[PDB]
Scaffold this active site. Structure first.
Site, PDB file in Angstrom:
ATOM      1  N   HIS A   1      11.633  44.941  57.806  1.00  0.00           N
ATOM      2  CA  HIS A   1      11.843  45.615  59.082  1.00  0.00           C
ATOM      3  C   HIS A   1      11.150  44.902  60.234  1.00  0.00           C
ATOM      4  CE1 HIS A   1       7.944  47.945  58.229  1.00  0.00           C
ATOM      5  NE2 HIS A   1       7.757  47.465  59.448  1.00  0.00           N
TER       6      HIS A   1
ATOM      7  N   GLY B   1       0.927  47.662  63.474  1.00  0.00           N
ATOM      8  CA  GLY B   1       0.598  46.291  63.126  1.00  0.00           C
ATOM      9  C   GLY B   1      -0.076  46.104  61.774  1.00  0.00           C
TER      10      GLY B   1
ATOM     11  N   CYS C   1       1.386  46.859  58.972  1.00  0.00           N
ATOM     12  CA  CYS C   1       2.468  46.527  58.050  1.00  0.00           C
ATOM     13  C   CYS C   1       2.334  45.113  57.495  1.00  0.00           C
ATOM     14  CB  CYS C   1       3.809  46.668  58.766  1.00  0.00           C
ATOM     15  SG  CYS C   1       4.230  48.377  58.968  1.00  0.00           S
TER      16      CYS C   1
HETATM   17  C1  LIG Z   1       4.052  48.603  60.733  1.00  0.00           C
HETATM   18  O1  LIG Z   1       3.019  47.923  61.441  1.00  0.00           O
HETATM   19  C2  LIG Z   1       3.956  50.122  60.856  1.00  0.00           C
HETATM   20  C3  LIG Z   1       2.729  50.816  60.247  1.00  0.00           C
HETATM   21  C4  LIG Z   1       2.701  52.268  60.743  1.00  0.00           C
HETATM   22  C5  LIG Z   1       2.457  52.355  62.250  1.00  0.00           C
HETATM   23  C6  LIG Z   1       1.267  53.301  62.443  1.00  0.00           C
HETATM   24  N1  LIG Z   1       0.815  53.612  61.097  1.00  0.00           N
HETATM   25  C7  LIG Z   1       1.592  53.080  60.142  1.00  0.00           C
HETATM   26  O2  LIG Z   1       1.479  53.227  58.933  1.00  0.00           O
HETATM   27  N2  LIG Z   1       5.180  50.730  60.356  1.00  0.00           N
HETATM   28  C8  LIG Z   1       6.010  51.285  61.239  1.00  0.00           C
HETATM   29  O3  LIG Z   1       5.689  51.498  62.412  1.00  0.00           O
HETATM   30  C9  LIG Z   1       7.367  51.654  60.709  1.00  0.00           C
HETATM   31  C10 LIG Z   1       8.453  50.794  61.378  1.00  0.00           C
HETATM   32  C11 LIG Z   1       9.874  51.088  60.876  1.00  0.00           C
HETATM   33  C12 LIG Z   1       9.854  51.492  59.397  1.00  0.00           C
HETATM   34  C13 LIG Z   1      11.183  51.236  58.684  1.00  0.00           C
HETATM   35  C14 LIG Z   1      12.371  51.187  59.642  1.00  0.00           C
HETATM   36  C15 LIG Z   1      12.213  50.097  60.679  1.00  0.00           C
HETATM   37  C16 LIG Z   1      10.760  49.854  61.071  1.00  0.00           C
HETATM   38  N3  LIG Z   1       7.620  53.072  60.878  1.00  0.00           N
HETATM   39  C17 LIG Z   1       6.742  54.028  60.567  1.00  0.00           C
HETATM   40  O4  LIG Z   1       5.625  53.855  60.069  1.00  0.00           O
HETATM   41  C18 LIG Z   1       7.235  55.405  60.915  1.00  0.00           C
HETATM   42  N4  LIG Z   1       7.571  56.243  59.765  1.00  0.00           N
HETATM   43  C19 LIG Z   1       8.657  57.021  59.783  1.00  0.00           C
HETATM   44  O5  LIG Z   1       9.275  57.208  60.829  1.00  0.00           O
HETATM   45  O6  LIG Z   1       9.098  57.676  58.541  1.00  0.00           O
HETATM   46  C20 LIG Z   1      10.219  58.578  58.535  1.00  0.00           C
HETATM   47  C21 LIG Z   1      10.078  59.727  59.540  1.00  0.00           C
HETATM   48  C22 LIG Z   1      10.774  59.746  60.767  1.00  0.00           C
HETATM   49  C23 LIG Z   1      10.629  60.790  61.692  1.00  0.00           C
HETATM   50  C24 LIG Z   1       9.783  61.856  61.386  1.00  0.00           C
HETATM   51  C25 LIG Z   1       9.097  61.840  60.171  1.00  0.00           C
HETATM   52  C26 LIG Z   1       9.240  60.798  59.252  1.00  0.00           C
HETATM   53  C27 LIG Z   1       6.182  56.025  61.816  1.00  0.00           C
HETATM   54  C28 LIG Z   1       5.986  55.146  63.061  1.00  0.00           C
HETATM   55  O7  LIG Z   1       6.631  57.334  62.148  1.00  0.00           O
HETATM   56  C29 LIG Z   1       5.692  58.326  62.536  1.00  0.00           C
HETATM   57  C30 LIG Z   1       5.758  58.497  64.078  1.00  0.00           C
HETATM   58  C31 LIG Z   1       6.091  59.595  61.781  1.00  0.00           C
HETATM   59  C32 LIG Z   1       4.309  57.851  62.087  1.00  0.00           C
END
Ligand SMILES: *[C@H](O)[C@H](C[C@@H]1CCNC1=O)NC(=O)[C@H](CC1CCCCC1)NC(=O)[C@@H](NC(=O)OCc1ccccc1)[C@@H](C)OC(C)(C)C
Ligand SMILES: *[C@H](O)[C@H](C[C@@H]1CCNC1=O)NC(=O)[C@H](CC1CCCCC1)NC(=O)[C@@H](NC(=O)OCc1ccccc1)[C@@H](C)OC(C)(C)C
Lengths: 306, 306
Positions: free
Chosen positions: B41, B143, B145
């Site tokens: 991603h 960051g 990830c």
């Molecule tokens: C990479 O550096 C980060 C690490 C995150 C950021 C802050 N803490 C972490 O653990 N990963 C992300 O930012 C990823 C990015 C996407 C993931 C796959 C698709 C393309 C890139 N996203 C998340 O970590 C999100 N998780 C998520 O949305 O899960 C499903 C979801 C959606 C909506 C509601 C509940 C659950 C994070 C950013 O989402 C939250 C805002 C819920 C933390």
């Protein structure tokens, strides 16, 4: 998000760990530039431990009675001296992996990382704090002596602790890297009082801020208090008295969360008077005091190193 | 003595961490031999995240759209491919610091060390466990990830986790190093159920043994129980059912402390039915389940590495 008790990456320190043997005693040493540092009680036999005259004992030793092994490699010792309770072995080879380093003496309430070591090889890494009574509550077996504690400032390794001995409490004592014990301890196998340990009030408040920052906010109340009022509750409860300086160091967390320090003190007061009711804060059922305010700031800022 | 939650020394892994940038997204990668591993991603824009077609998105990219930076040094990318949810960047330079390594898929209940990383530089190190619901409760900011989890077997690094995303729980999800998620998670910004988490019953018993080994023995009672009886209490209480295999893996701690596993189960039962009464075991007011029995054995045996 999330909040863990987190140690510095130990790579810069792993490259400094060596095995030190003298007679029938082996322990760890810290190899930096052309000097090896280790507890001076490596020169002691298991009888010497009860009442050692270190000067007299050191006189019977010569450079070649000291085997230093860096990994597989034998270093040649060419000078030896005793500085306080550490022994400094001058070797013919500078450590090619010497980090940029400093020796600091830390203060009660500050935190550092320990790399626990046996026979000169690293075993594990964990974080902790110099308690108010100048003990640390770690994990040290036989042969862990000479393991060091440290903090990292971007590239620079600040060494602050060298492990020497366990008390009868399972608490641990040791020295800075100039060989002066933290606390009133001496390096002898004689009963020694650690002393009443107090809780690091400012660290607990910084943790409560880390909690708020990470969603846990049930402890937050409608009250406030005064510095003197709260301090009065701090003392029925073992807590370090809170000073204005403590308040200022908590200032940045104050402004990030929009919560006054003295309001936070009121919540802590209610916790101290009412307990946890079987609930948890950042997954602990206890009030945690081994995160400094700076540990909190950087854990939710993402400070890196190397 | 003493007992801390302890992470492997991260030196072997620090030398593998690099920065990976593609477009306006930067995260960490794992550099081993001539391949860089990272979450796929990284190829996504902040709009792509809601519903990405990774094949179509990857097609629009070419080798030179991928900036890999190892410390200061730019690696040249010469092949790219997608394996499950990881992206494998073929570079022109083998990592001179590649440890002896393996890629393993771990099991729920096992533990590993995380080196949390930003922009390719290590930030901190901590220990944890793959929960029964295939989440980890860590500490990850934006960051982080591409940070990896690992265990060390003397010299050999077993990589098992790569961090991809935080759920709405502050729990974290990710993949093995072949890119398959632990648990049912997909890499998309869509609500996802983590599922009911259970407690790692065998790990809790191993901890109680670590407690006994380190002087804490108040929880020890005059009772015993049966595997089925205790299991019946395990389930009103969220606990993983205890199997004969669990009993055998606890066998060595059994024999060291001279305490039958089922006697220990009875003490755990009373704890689960009667709580802590405001007391502590190894300085925790909760029942800790992120030490495997092997974590216990080696912490009080002093196993080293490198
Ligand atoms: C990479 O550096 C980060 C690490 C995150 C950021 C802050 N803490 C972490 O653990 N990963 C992300 O930012 C990823 C990015 C996407 C993931 C796959 C698709 C393309 C890139 N996203 C998340 O970590 C999100 N998780 C998520 O949305 O899960 C499903 C979801 C959606 C909506 C509601 C509940 C659950 C994070 C950013 O989402 C939250 C805002 C819920 C933390
Ligand atoms: C070096 O590898 C070890 C590390 C110890 C061993 C197990 N866990 C540890 O933390 N250090 C020692 O073994 C040192 C050795 C002597 C210390 C200075 C004098 C010459 C060498 N000793 C101890 O760690 C002891 N501490 C101690 O005796 O303190 C005073 C005391 C004496 C008698 C009763 C109470 C207190 C340990 C070995 O003593 C205990 C048996 C109490 C742990």
């Amino acid at each position: 998000s999330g909040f863990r008790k987190m140690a510095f990456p130990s790579g810069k320190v792993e490259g400094c760990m060596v095995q030190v043997t003298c007679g029938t005693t082996t322990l760890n040493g810290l190899w930096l530039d052309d000097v090896v540092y280790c507890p001076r009680h490596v020169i002691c036999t298991s009888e010497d431990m009860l009442n050692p005259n270190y000067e007299d004992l050191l006189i019977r030793k010569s450079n070649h009675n000291f085997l230093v092994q860096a990994g597989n490699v034998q270093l040649r010792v060419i000078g030896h001296s005793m500085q306080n309770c550490v022994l400094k072995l001058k070797v013919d080879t500078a450590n090619p992996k010497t980090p940029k380093y400093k020796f600091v003496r830390i203060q009660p309430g500050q935190t550092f990382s320990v790399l626990a070591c046996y026979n000169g090889s690293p075993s594990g890494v964990y974080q902790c704090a110099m308690r108010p009574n100048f003990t640390i509550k770690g994990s040290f077996l036989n042969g862990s002596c000479g393991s060091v504690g440290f903090n990292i400032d971007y590239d620079c390794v600040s060494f602050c602790y060298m492990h020497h001995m366990e008390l009868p409490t399972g608490v641990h004592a040791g020295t800075d890297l100039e060989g002066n014990f933290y606390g009133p301890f001496v390096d002898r196998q004689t009963a020694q009082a650690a002393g009443t340990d107090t809780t690091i009030t400012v660290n607990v408040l910084a943790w409560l801020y880390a909690a708020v920052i990470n969603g846990d906010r049930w402890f937050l109340n409608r009250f406030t208090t005064t510095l003197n009022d709260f301090n009065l509750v701090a003392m029925k409860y073992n807590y370090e008295p809170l000073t204005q300086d403590h308040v200022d160091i908590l200032g940045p967390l104050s402004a990030q969360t929009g919560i006054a320090v003295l309001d936070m003190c009121a919540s802590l007061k209610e916790l101290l008077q009412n307990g946890m009711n079987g609930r948890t804060i950042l997954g602990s059922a206890l009030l945690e005091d081994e995160f400094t305010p700076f540990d909190v700031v950087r854990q939710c800022s993402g400070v890196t190193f190397q």
